[PDB]
Amino acid sequence: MISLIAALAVDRVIGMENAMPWNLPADLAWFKRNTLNKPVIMGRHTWESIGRPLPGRKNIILSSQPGTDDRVTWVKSVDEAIAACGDVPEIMVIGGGRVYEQFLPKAQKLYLTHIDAEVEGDTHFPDYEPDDWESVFSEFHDADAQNSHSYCFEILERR
Ligand SMILES: NC(=O)c1ccc[n+]([C@@H]2O[C@H](COP(=O)([O-])OP(=O)(O)OC[C@H]3O[C@@H](n4cnc5c(N)ncnc54)[C@H](OP(=O)(O)O)[C@@H]3O)[C@@H](O)[C@H]2O)c1
Ligand SMILES: Nc1nc(=O)c2nc(CNc3ccc(C(=O)N[C@@H](CCC(=O)O)C(=O)O)cc3)cnc2[nH]1
């Protein structure tokens, strides 16, 4: 099973040239909880902004170019990224935009965080059709002293 995890602002914005203008540690705890002990597949731009290997996960980085950090696994295509995951119950694709686009048609589950923030971004989560997906879990949270904006966690499973 392939899943995608992402945090989207309005208009499905997931990235901009500069750091996102929000602080959502609860969302990062959710990302950690849902990715721990699973392989995570990411694109090279996302690798760079994470800055280190994610602990307790097998880190697979897609890049057309030779790898530059022997602590993680580098692959040059989607089929190779999947093959590097081995025989696991769930592969987590953690972005970014170009990677989500390529894995969305393969995915059976989406873990999405919807952030009540309007930002201009250069990178979007792909268009998905609500009717293709069944919302199996959703949990809204208000902003609070640690989290700058309200946000809602949702898990969708492919119909
Ligand atoms: N809010 C969120 O949930 C979230 C999640 C993840 C990322 N992001 C954000 O999204 C942005 C990054 O998105 P992006 O679309 O720019 O970058 P990305 O998808 O992270 O990385 C793209 C790079 O990955 C490699 N790649 C992708 N598909 C490949 C394939 N089939 N074969 C070989 N290499 C492949 C290429 O690396 P080479 O260039 O080395 O060939 C390509 O330049 C940032 O702003 C980041 O912080 C947000
Ligand atoms: N829901 C969601 N929110 C995100 O911010 C997000 N970010 C990415 C890509 N970027 C990142 C950036 C940093 C970390 C990170 O540092 N995570 C740590 C800290 C978790 C915590 O603070 O509790 C980790 O161990 O997962 C992960 C992914 C992919 N999917 C996401 N999904």
Numbering used by the authors: 1 to 159
Mind quoting what the paper says about this structure?
Dihydrofolate reductase (DHFR) is a key enzyme that is essential for the synthesis of purines, thymidylic acids and some amino acids. DHFR catalyzes the reduction of 7,8-dihydrofolate to 5,6,7,8-tetrahydrofolate using NADPH as a cofactor and plays an influential role in folate (FOL) management in many species. The M20 loop of ecDHFR can adopt three conformations (open, closed and occluded). We determined the structure of ecDHFR in complex with FOL and NADP+ under pressures varying between 0.1 and 800 MPa.
Hence, for the open conformation two independent molecules, A and B, existed in the asymmetric unit of the P21 crystal at lower pressures. Because little difference existed between the two molecules, only the B chain is discussed and presented in the figures. In the M20-open crystal, a crystal-to-crystal phase transition occurred between 270 and 500 MPa. The space group of the crystal changed from P21 to C2. Below 270 MPa, the nicotinamide moiety of NADP+ made van der Waals contacts with the pteridine moiety of FOL. The guanidinium moiety of Arg57 directly interacted with the carboxyl group of FOL between 0.1 and 660 MPa. The M20-open crystals contained (110, 107), (85, 88), 130, 137 and 134 water molecules at 0.1, 270, 500, 660 and 750 MPa, respectively (the pairs of values in parentheses indicate the numbers for the A and B chains in the asymmetric unit). The low number of water molecules in the M20-open crystal at 270 MPa may be related to the phase transition.
